[PDB]
Amino acid sequence: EDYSVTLQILALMTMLGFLPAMVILMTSFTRIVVVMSILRQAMGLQQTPSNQVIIGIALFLTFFVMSPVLNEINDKAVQPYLNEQVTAREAFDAAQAPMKAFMLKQTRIKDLETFVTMSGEQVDNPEDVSMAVLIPAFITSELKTAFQIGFMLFLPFLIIDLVVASVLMAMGMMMLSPMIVSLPFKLMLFVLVDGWNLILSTLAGSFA
Amino acid sequence: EDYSVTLQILALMTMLGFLPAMVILMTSFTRIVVVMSILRQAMGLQQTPSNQVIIGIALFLTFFVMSPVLNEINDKAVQPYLNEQVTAREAFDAAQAPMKAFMLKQTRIKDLETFVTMSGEQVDNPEDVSMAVLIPAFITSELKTAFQIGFMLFLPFLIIDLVVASVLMAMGMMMLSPMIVSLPFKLMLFVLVDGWNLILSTLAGSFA
Amino acid sequence: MTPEMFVELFREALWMVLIMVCAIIIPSLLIGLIVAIFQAATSINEQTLSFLPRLIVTLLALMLFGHWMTQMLMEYFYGLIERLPQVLY
Amino acid sequence: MTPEMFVELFREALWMVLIMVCAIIIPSLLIGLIVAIFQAATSINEQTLSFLPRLIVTLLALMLFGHWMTQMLMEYFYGLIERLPQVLY
């Protein structure tokens, strides 16, 4: 029994209310922000890239990597729903399935095992867990993955900081701040290596 | 075909909401903002120019450097629109072209190449890429270009700091901080070179 | 992240900084030793006599090893990027 | 629980960092004395000479003790986690 038109309007107007939650939890927006946040802290500049610019690039990145799932939602759920091929519940289920496939692809088993036991439900295959138990397992997996990526990017800047600090101690000028005398070299390394392109490419590549 | 008066107002009122986003992403505000932050870091003072003043100068300069684009927007888009010579559809497209041309001129091929392959679209020439694939690329190139200009300005103040640090170390005083001694000379170098006119003129001239 | 890989990244980072810092300091260490030996032979006790020669050879070393240090830092960053898929499967 | 048990935890943690810092520093301290006594015997008065030798062994010690210090931090975290029941009971 399909829902009335008034309920269906009220149902999908509620989705707009929860739209920010979906981006920060069920999408790739979480990892991209974290990696660029750690990358900013790796360089000497404190808040030069700015939060709004970081979010802006992240929104474009999360839109480009979620296009296949968004296209699958449209071509499996939205189009049949607009063309009266399936009902409201079937359209809702058809839209959720590609979303669940994306979260399960980029998650960890141990994280899934941790949450299935606490919830207390039988599981025999990965593709049987409810979305209520997949969301907290997915974000935990993303945070660990984001931290690992941030660690790799941090190391080359740490090497420069150690070198420049040790060289100043070699001449004996201990009072001179390594941080000020290392910022130009940290910035230059990010330039000639062209960090702003490969790092975003790796973030896009890491999800696929 | 042509949008109704009520829809035209709704679209125009929508763009006012995104006006701060277009300033920090689609104009010269970001590069000028970054350079002054690096220039301030190069000198010993970390909060003397003050954030409000720096953004105020950035807003005035971005008004001066975007004037050729704004005048083209006025002439191509607004004047035919107000005289009912073009529809609302044509006016919006005619306004977008000069803004897209400005962002295409300051971007980098590799940055365009990076996002084109990420967006999965078939593009033959850079001068016809979509807006959604140009904004992330344009801001990426601006950040990289800002770092290069900042490194240029950082070196002269770094040399003064290194010179004064070694002179103090030669005389055997390894406990006097070079930062205090170097600061008056860092300020003077920015004065007799007329830094606040030289730096801003180069930043404005960097978009020509 | 397995503990074995963490030590491997730690060691290669420490090995890289060790190579860079030793290549720079050694020219200053040799000159400082030579001046100290010279002072002992002639029996003089000036302290800062062996500062400017150390600074000159250190700056000259950085000019000569500018190409070498730049390439290694770029290579190392590229290596970590290429090693990323191995870290997270 | 009781404040004394917290003191035992904090003394245990400070004891571990003492082991961590000792393993790293002592190799550098020995080299510092070896060079200093050698300079004293040879009447060499270069105060900044014995910096790179201390740095080399310090970096080597970090690479050599990479596995042990890892195993030890992780097991300390597990030890605290398994000791959480003490707090809950």
Place this chain on the structure above:
Amino acid sequence: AGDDILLQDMGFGVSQRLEQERLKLSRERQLAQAIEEMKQVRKARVLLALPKHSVFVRHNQEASASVFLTLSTGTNLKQQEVDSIVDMVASAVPGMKTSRITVTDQHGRLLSSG
């Protein structure tokens, strides 16, 4: 004489993996030594494979064993004796259900499924 590995002090610098390997090897040695005192067995070798135990069936790996025996000059082990062998080995190692112990002999005749 299997316990010697345990009573030793592994030198600083052995990774965790190698530590687990050496503990497992000590257990293998002591199991083989215990089997040596069998009336019919004159020599024995045991090999182990550790489990993983992840609920999701498609991912659980489960433990395993493989024991080779060189018995006396003559005699053939009865079904009871090999059953006792597999039960002892299965109980000694945590988990590893007795239906996953592979037993052979000198002549190569199979004695237990895998």
Place this chain on the structure above:
Amino acid sequence: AGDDILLQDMGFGVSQRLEQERLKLSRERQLAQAIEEMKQVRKARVLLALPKHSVFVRHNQEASASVFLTLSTGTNLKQQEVDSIVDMVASAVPGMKTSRITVTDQHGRLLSSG
């Protein structure tokens, strides 16, 4: 005498990959030992192939093996013997369902096939 690698002290210089290899090599050695004690076999050489078994929820690569045998001057192994060999080898190594092992002989006649 396979365990020599295991009891040895891996000095500074080994790096992840190598360690796994040596660990793998260790089992290979002792696996050869288990095959040698059989009357029919004179020499046995074992090679393994163990994939990563990724942490994310994906597919693994179904670990595999390849064992070569050199028997006595005459004689042929009956199928019971080769089944015992493949069961022992497959159960010794974690994973590798027994249908993923290649067994050959000195003359080169095929005995199985993953």
Place this chain on the structure above:
Amino acid sequence: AGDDILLQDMGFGVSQRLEQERLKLSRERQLAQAIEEMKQVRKARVLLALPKHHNQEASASVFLTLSTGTNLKQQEVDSIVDMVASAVPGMKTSRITVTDQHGRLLSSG
């Protein structure tokens, strides 16, 4: 005697890539060893190809010089290709090229 590379300690200066290559070398060498015990085969060489993590998929090529006479039957080449395929992780059996001294191809690729 293939394991000599593994039991040695790579001289410091090796850098990731080289290590992988050396490991590959080891496999190749010992695989050749296993082929030498074949009665029909007198000398053998194995070349491997494992892709870096459009996936390339793995590959191998085993080149043999047999004894003075004789030619390999399909059973023998089947055994050789099965052994090579299962020794290297991955590399489904249809991707191994087996040839001989005279140059008669024994397996596609």
Place this chain on the structure above:
Amino acid sequence: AGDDILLQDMGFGVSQRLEQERLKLSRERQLAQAIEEMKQVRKARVLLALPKHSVFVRHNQEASASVFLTLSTGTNLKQQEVDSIVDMVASAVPGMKTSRITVTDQHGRLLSSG
């Protein structure tokens, strides 16, 4: 005798790039050495052409090989022989689909296109 490059130890100053080139050179050397085992051919020279690769790219190069041969004083390669040669070359290198090898000889009769 190609493996000499691999078992050697490069000194300080070899960048990642030169190292990759030397790896390619080593594989080319061993491929040519293996090809020399052909009864017909006296000398073979293998060149490779490999893209930068690295994952997370939009590679638009694809691989290539170029093998230049000198046969005996007489004799000519039959199409089956050159097919076997090109199959061996294509299977030796990761990638490089078999339709991307140029094979020539001492006289210049091309044996495969590209």
Place this chain on the structure above:
Amino acid sequence: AGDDILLQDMGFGVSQRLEQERLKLSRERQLAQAIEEMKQVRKARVLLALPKHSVFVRHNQEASASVFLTLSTGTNLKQQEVDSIVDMVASAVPGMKTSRITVTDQHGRLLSSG
């Protein structure tokens, strides 16, 4: 005889431009080495030009090559020979589609499109 550049070493001082140029020079020299063995040909000098590979066609530069030859005192190359040579060169270097190679001779008769 080309591999000297690769199998030598370069002291901290060869920058990235110089590294790329030297690698290209190794390519040129070894391709000339491959062409010397041609029965008809006596000397060949090869020049290269690396590509850029930008998706934007108006910005792409594309790879190029130019091979100059001095054959024997007599003989003139039949078009099959020049096609085989240009195919070898085109497959030798990554990129440079077979129509982006110029072939000339001692007398200056054009032998390929440019």
Place this chain on the structure above:
Amino acid sequence: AGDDILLQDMGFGVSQRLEQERLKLSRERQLAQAIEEMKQVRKARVLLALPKHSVFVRHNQEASASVFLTLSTGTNLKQQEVDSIVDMVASAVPGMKTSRITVTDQHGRLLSSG
């Protein structure tokens, strides 16, 4: 023997501009030497002009060249020979479509537009 500059090592103190100029000189020397092998020419001097290939989406400057010759005491170049010369030169240098070279002689007869 243009390879002198490349296989030489620049001591520290050369600037980026000078490095590019030296590479350009190396290419010019080797191209002139390659042109010298031709029958009709006695000496050839090639000069280049390569802009910097801007990074952003700005239009570039379409690099150009200029080749000057002194030929044999007699003879005059036919259009085919000058076409082959200019095509080799244009293909050697990256960029510079073949219409952007000037060819001259000892007398000064113009042989290509610019």
Place this chain on the structure above:
Amino acid sequence: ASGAKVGADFNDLLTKAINNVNTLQKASGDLQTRFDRGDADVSLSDVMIARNKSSVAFDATVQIRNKLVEAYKDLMNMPV
């Protein structure tokens, strides 16, 4: 007393109320369309009673949703 069990139970409780609202709206719409099409055996009182019930039921659905959405926003926007 498992997480999946209670999650299903409250989902069953929630979907029951939604179905109850849907039943009232469909019944209200069915009565309206039969009376409007000209069916003689349909009284205006039944039509008016049903459509008043649906309005109250839908009004409760919107108000309950607003309480839940505001409660969700309160917990998410708190200054942790």
